[PDB]
Amino acid sequence: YQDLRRRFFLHHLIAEXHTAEI
Amino acid sequence: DVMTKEEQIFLLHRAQAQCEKRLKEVLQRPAGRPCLPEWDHILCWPLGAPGEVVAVPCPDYIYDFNHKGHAYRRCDRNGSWELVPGHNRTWANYSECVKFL
Ligand SMILES: [Zn+2]
Incomplete structure (x- = not known):
């Protein structure tokens, strides 16, 4: 599950980050 | 061998401290x-x-990113980073970095 924990944290950074499609 | 969330957070902290020094x-x-x-x-x-x-290689310390890709910002003609109007955000395109997530 360590892969999921890490990736799900990255999800938050990207959501809060990648803004060109807003 | 797996990279833990804790290591990934450490690597972000290290990159943040380097950014401050830069x-x-x-x-x-x-x-x-x-x-x-x-x-x-x-x-x-x-x-x-x-x-x-401004194009930046998708960072190698983010384990899950597409390292062959780039992320993009734009510097405006007044020397300010371009914004997303109506949102409290700087414009940035990370699509290449996340295309295989
Ligand atoms: Zn969450």
Whole structure:
């Protein structure tokens, strides 16, 4: 599950980050 | 061998500290008003010339990113990073970095 924990944290950074499609 | 969340967070902290040192350094150079290094919680954006589209390799310390890709900002002609109007956000395109997530 360590892969999921890490990736799900990255999800938050990207959501809060990648803004060109807003 | 797996990279833990805790290691990934450490690597972000290390990149953030490097970004702070970088900003302090370039601020001591001769300059006009380029867009300045900024930490966004993923990347340290480098100096940008007024007007230019700034491309950064998707960072190698983010284990899950597409390292063959680039992320993009734009420096405006006044030397300010381009914004997303109506949202409290700087414009940044990370689509290439996340295309296989
Ligand atoms: Zn969550």
